From Swiss-Prot:
The modification N6-acetyllysine is found at residues 48, 74. It is found in: Nucleus; Cytoplasm; Melanosome; Cell membrane. The lineage of its organism: Eukaryota, Metazoa, Chordata, Craniata, Vertebrata. One of its GO terms (biological process) is protein stabilization. The TPR repeat-binding motif mediates interaction with TPR repeat-containing proteins like the co-chaperone STUB1. The keyword Secreted does not apply. GO terms for cellular component: apical plasma membrane; axonal growth cone; basolateral plasma membrane; brush border membrane; cell surface; cytoplasm; cytosol; dendritic growth cone. ISGylated. S-nitrosylated; negatively regulates the ATPase activity and the activation of eNOS by HSP90AA1. Homodimer. Identified in NR3C1/GCR steroid receptor-chaperone complexes formed at least by NR3C1, HSP90AA1 and a variety of proteins containing TPR repeats such as FKBP4, FKBP5, PPID, PPP5C or STIP1. Forms a complex containing HSP90AA1, TSC1 and TSC2; TSC1 is required to recruit TCS2 to the complex. The closed form interacts (via the middle domain and TPR repeat-binding motif) with co-chaperone TSC1 (via C-terminus). Interacts with TOM34. Interacts with TERT; the interaction, together with PTGES3, is required for correct assembly and stabilization of the TERT holoenzyme complex. (Microbial infection) Interacts with herpes simplex virus 1 protein US11; this interaction inhibits TBK1-induced interferon production. This is Heat shock protein HSP 90-alpha. ATP binds at residues 41, 83, 102, 128. Changing residue 37 to A: Strong ATP-binding. Strong interaction with HSF1, HIF1A, ERBB2, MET, KEAP1 and RHOBTB2. No effect on interaction with TSC1.
């Protein structure tokens, strides 16, 4: 048979759609904090599975290794983050990545117009959107125990898609692929990735491996 795959198209909650616009169509220095934000979500999802793990070891039969991979590809112009954390069910994605309103959205947008540092993004509960400071498209692949694997993808423009993922399986965790803008290729550079990591991510308690082409 010719392949047939299922897709669902969603609208970003109105206010999150505003934030994303602000984020993309405005200039901010200190963009490197996007990598700090990624690594912290990865680290939080890793905490989660490890906590569940204390009580139910079979929770790890989908993966015993707790770590975070970094993978820049200049050919594709992608920076990919990979962790072996808790993962996301379908609901988690939909409710966490765009559909549902965030308490922090209105305040953060205001704080930015008042001249606040883009770096505050995380504090206001919307740090995942820091990805659009450097990326024109973002793909999120995730696998949670007792559920299937999903792909979530957006180029912003107020919309996003979700689909049961047929691609390469990950046992468990989330993978985030950032398709960098052209002015932001500096984040595909090994030297700059190590510099950002060593500066902003030294509190992280899981090994970070950087794969270098
Ligand atoms: C790198 O971006 C991510 C990495 C992730 O592992 C995760 C993730 O799967 N989780 C689950 C979880 C559970 C408790 C607390 C936080 C989180 C985030 C998410 C992202 C971003 C796409 C938000």
């Amino acid at each position: 048979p010719m392949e047939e795959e299922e897709v669902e198209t969603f609208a970003f909650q109105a206010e999150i759609a505003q934030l994303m616009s602000l984020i993309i169509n405005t200039f901010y220095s200190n963009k490197e904090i996007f990598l700090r934000e990624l690594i912290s979500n990865s680290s939080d999802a890793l905490d989660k599975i490890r906590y569940e793990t204390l009580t139910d070891p079979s929770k790890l039969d989908s993966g015993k290794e707790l770590h975070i991979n970094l993978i820049p590809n200049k050919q594709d112009r992608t920076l990919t983050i990979v962790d072996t954390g808790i993962g996301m069910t379908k609901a988690d994605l939909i409710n966490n990545l765009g559909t549902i309103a965030k308490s922090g959205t209105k305040a953060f947008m205001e704080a930015l117009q008042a001249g606040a540092d883009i770096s505050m993004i995380g504090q206001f509960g919307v740090g995942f959107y820091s990805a659009y400071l450097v990326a024109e498209k973002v793909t999120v692949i995730t696998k949670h125990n007792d559920d299937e694997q999903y792909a979530w993808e957006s180029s912003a423009g107020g919309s996003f898609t979700v689909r049961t993922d047929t691609g390469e399986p990950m046992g468990r965790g989330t993978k985030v692929i950032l398709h960098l803008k052209e002015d932001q290729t500096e984040y595909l550079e090994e030297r700059r990735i190590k510099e950002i990591v060593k500066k902003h991510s030294q509190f992280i308690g899981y090994p970070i491996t950087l794969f270098v082409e």
